[PDB]
């Protein structure tokens with residue numbers, strides 16, 4: 001019996017920041033409404049592709065773990081916004097990092113993708129011959145947004161988070177997990193016409209709908225994450241009070257609060273950074289984990305509950321038992337190339353096109 | 358304690374519209390003579406429906422074949438590089454279509470090696486955790502991507518889907534050892550760089566994307582990648598090469614398949630080939646081939662199978678499957694695609710005209 005210890009953690013947030021005030025200059029919205037309803041103050045807009053965000057996050061996690069790129073056997077990138085479909089962006093991260101041989105694939109389960117990835121990498125390592133793995137959640141959601149619709153335009157940001165996993169006999173890392181999907185919620189969070197269903201030669205194919213029914217997402221997410229968390233906790237044999245930290249998906253603060261309240265988990269145990277970055281889909285959990293560790297929220301031997309949901313409607317929860325070390329072995333100098341533009345400047349073309357159309 | 362994931366169901370979905378080599382000759386400077394001689398491809402299928410619809414039908418056939426209830430399916434993996442949509446994933450669409458409650462549902466992209474990646478992943482998930490039954494699907498609508506003015510690539514690819522159902526068991530069956538990987542130095546020799554979030558969303562000409570393709574370099578890297586993976590798998594199995602009963606390869610090029618077998622010392626007649634009927638269907642190739650090998654009586658109970666594949670990445674893989682007792686379906690499915698009211702040329706008419714005009 002082995003386990004997959006989380007030995008490295010890292011993040012990459014692009015520098016360009018879009019404030020609620022910035023959004024109010026081109027949409028009929030306010031910082032007052034957004035902060036009160038969502039809890040989001042700011043979000044980051046990438047000047048580079050998803051794979052570049054993923055690469056920097058991975059470099060930080062590798063340094064943190066002190067592992068050699070020659071030791072990495074498996075690379076999973078969880079994303080719904082890959083640079084390209086052919087080939088996958090896991091292979092681009094592999095190419096960028098100079099990792100020889102590793103299995104490299106992209107996984108799409110929306111914002112639950114990082115937990116899906118962590119479950120998958122963990123079980124691969126437990127049942128087969130993978131010694132070290134790199135699991136990355138990375139998104140450039142700004143690509144997708146309709147800048148005339150305030151409902152969806154204020155919720156999402158770009159970013160990437162990463163972990164490195166190391167095979168061990170110590171009972172650490174992901175213990176039980178339950179992942180799933182409520183396919184009856186499929187049509188309430190969707191971009192139906194980007195992908196091979198779109199008309200390739202229609203000049204207006206860029207003006208797609210972002211389907212979004214917020215109250216239905218709320219209900220299904222709470223139900224989905226809640227029951228998954230219960231299964232995990234029940235299988236662990238832990239009482240609810242033994243959970244030290246909750247690392248949730250960062251989509252909505254009231255969802256996080258409701259999840260904890262219905263579970264009877266203390267509100268102050270949930271790590272929240274949505275105010276800074278908004279919803280970065282698959283990046284939310286690994287960015288949050290990385291920041292929780294940086295800010296001293298996770299102690300050695302802590303019991304963590306991870307929980308997430310996403311378009312699908314995918315859902316999941318996991319129980320992580322932390323090991324001995326909460327400090328990086330090394331630091332990485334890795335950074336994105338310099339950003340010569342403001343967030344409004346980056347979005348200028350897309351805003352003008354959506355408004356004209 | 359030690360369990361295994363038996364392949365208990367297999368199924369396929371090939372769309373009805375057939376594009377012949379003659380059809381291709383009416384709008385490209387090519388001939389059936391050249392294509393059949395050079396590639397061995399006679400026909401390929403062009404879908405009138407989205408990838409998820411192909412995936413759904415293949416799954417229905419596999420589920421009937423396995424005699425499993427949709428309530429028993431705990432995991433759905435769709436390997437594809439041509440999904441209907443990115444948000445949400447198409448695994449969830451298959452789940453919605455089939456009425457599967459609760460199952461983990463995700464899309465996996467490792468190009469044509471995706472089915473083997475999927476089979477490895479589902480197997481290990483079942484071995485290390487609480488998944489009793491899984492559905493693993495390779496499904497593609499590659500016709501979406503093609504430049505119909507370029508005969509080089511336009512004659513090689515097709516649409517389709519294949520599926521398996523896996524069932525947890527104590528019997529030493531299903532996927533035994535596997536080795537999967539990626540040669541990222543081959544990343545730039547097979548690619549469609551400008552479809553995805555790297556593309557200009559508001560450029561009216563963003564549909565006319567280029568391909569990176571260096572055929573001799575793909576050949577070399579694919580043979581090297583699959584060959585060494587197959588060796589690792591065989592070496593870990595403790596089997597001699599003569600004990601392999603059937604090879605189920607990726608159907609990209611017949612000389613690649615031949616070279617793989619020759620360098621491994623595997624008899625050429627053990628490799629199952631259906632590229633002549635369907636061309637390269639990326640992640641669907643292996644599961645369609647497996648399904649057809651079973652239908653045609655090529656796989657016996659207790660046979661040792663070698664699966665091998667490669668794809669853009671350059672991803673690569675091999676697997677050793679030990680077959681169990683049953684090679685016949687428990688049930689048949691009536692599931693079919695909706696009627697196709699168009700010929701393959703009619704389906705491709707708009708895309709052909711646009712590519713020619715541009």
Ligand SMILES: CC(C)(COP(=O)(O)OP(=O)(O)OC[C@H]1O[C@@H](n2cnc3c(N)ncnc32)[C@H](O)[C@@H]1OP(=O)(O)O)[C@@H](O)C(=O)NCCC(=O)NCCS
Nearest residue numbers: 386387388391395396508509512572573575576609610612
């Ligand atoms: C076995 C192998 C020789 C197969 O070759 P092939 O792709 O079937 O055919 P080739 O690319 O060698 O083409 C041979 C000639 O036919 C011509 N040709 C190509 N497509 C044609 C068409 N549709 N009609 C008529 N002639 C054509 C070419 O001009 C070429 O001549 P050239 O060498 O002077 O350019 C292999 O070594 C190879 O090169 N494969 C390339 C692709 C590959 O290996 N994998 C792709 C999977 S994604």
Ligand SMILES: CCCCCCCC(=O)O
Nearest residue numbers: 468469499502639668669
């Ligand atoms: C132009 C798109 C064709 C599909 C390329 C991937 C096929 C493979 O992996 O073998």
